[PDB]
Amino acid sequence: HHHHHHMVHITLDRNTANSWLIISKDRRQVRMGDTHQNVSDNKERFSNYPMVLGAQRFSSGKMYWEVDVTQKEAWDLGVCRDSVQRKGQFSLSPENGFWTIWLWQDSYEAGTSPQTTLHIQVPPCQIGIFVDYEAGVVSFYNITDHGSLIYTFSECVFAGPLRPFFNVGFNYSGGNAAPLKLCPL
Numbered sequence: 758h759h760h761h762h763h764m765v766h767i768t769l770d771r772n773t774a775n776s777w778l779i780i781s782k783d784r785r786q787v788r789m790g791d792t793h794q795n796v797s798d799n800k801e802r803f804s805n806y807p808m809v810l811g812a813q814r815f816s817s818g819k820m821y822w823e824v825d826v827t828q829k830e831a832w833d834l835g836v837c838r839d840s841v842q843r844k845g846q847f848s849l850s851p852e853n854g855f856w857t858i859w860l861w862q863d864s865y866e867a868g869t870s871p872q873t874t875l876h877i878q879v880p881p882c883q884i885g886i887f888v889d890y891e892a893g894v895v896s897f898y899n900i901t902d903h904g905s906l907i908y909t910f911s912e913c914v915f916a917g918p919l920r921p922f923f924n925v926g927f928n929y930s931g932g933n934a935a936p937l938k939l940c941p942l
């Protein structure tokens with residue numbers, strides 16, 4: 758792919774984070790804490806899952822960023838509507854305003870309804886995310902495997918401003934403590 762030149766500098770929005778997340782001072786890394794991180798509750802925070810949004814809002818153009826997932830067992834990544842539900846249980850689907858992929862139990866899947874099996878020969882350590890707002894496209898790339906395509910959502914109906922979306926996953930196993938990191942441009 759030749760999307761690197763649409764690179765954007767993403768930072769995480771503390772105010773949207775689940776109350777157990779720890780966001781680094783530079784707002785470029787997030788991990789699961791072992792307890793509540795001593796913040797007040799607010800209507801923006803994801804309550805049920807270890808999720809957080811980027812601060813940036815996109816309503817036009819082409820955007821590209823990269824995320825480091827090294828040594829994680831579980832995570833979700835992509836974009837979502839600014840108006841997605843924050844509280845209670847929900848599925849990651851385009852009907853609910855999410856365009857995402859994930860790792861779970863040694864398999865990679867795209868957040869369609871129902872979910873789609875991904876075919877990855879080289880487990881990725883870094884994921885590239887490309888959004889073309891006007892075209893209605895969200896694509897995922899395997900940076901570890903020379904940028905190979907993972908998945909394309911096309912005919913997307915964004916229906917609002919988009920925000921970068923992250924889920925660090927639970928750490929019931931003790932094997933999923935590692936952070937998500939936004940990689941330098």
Ligand SMILES: Cn1ccc(C(=O)NC[C@H]2CCCO2)n1
Binds near residue numbers: 798800
């Ligand atoms: C499950 N559910 C429905 C609505 C809410 C909500 O807004 N909670 C946030 C807090 C902290 C201050 C006000 O309430 N949570």
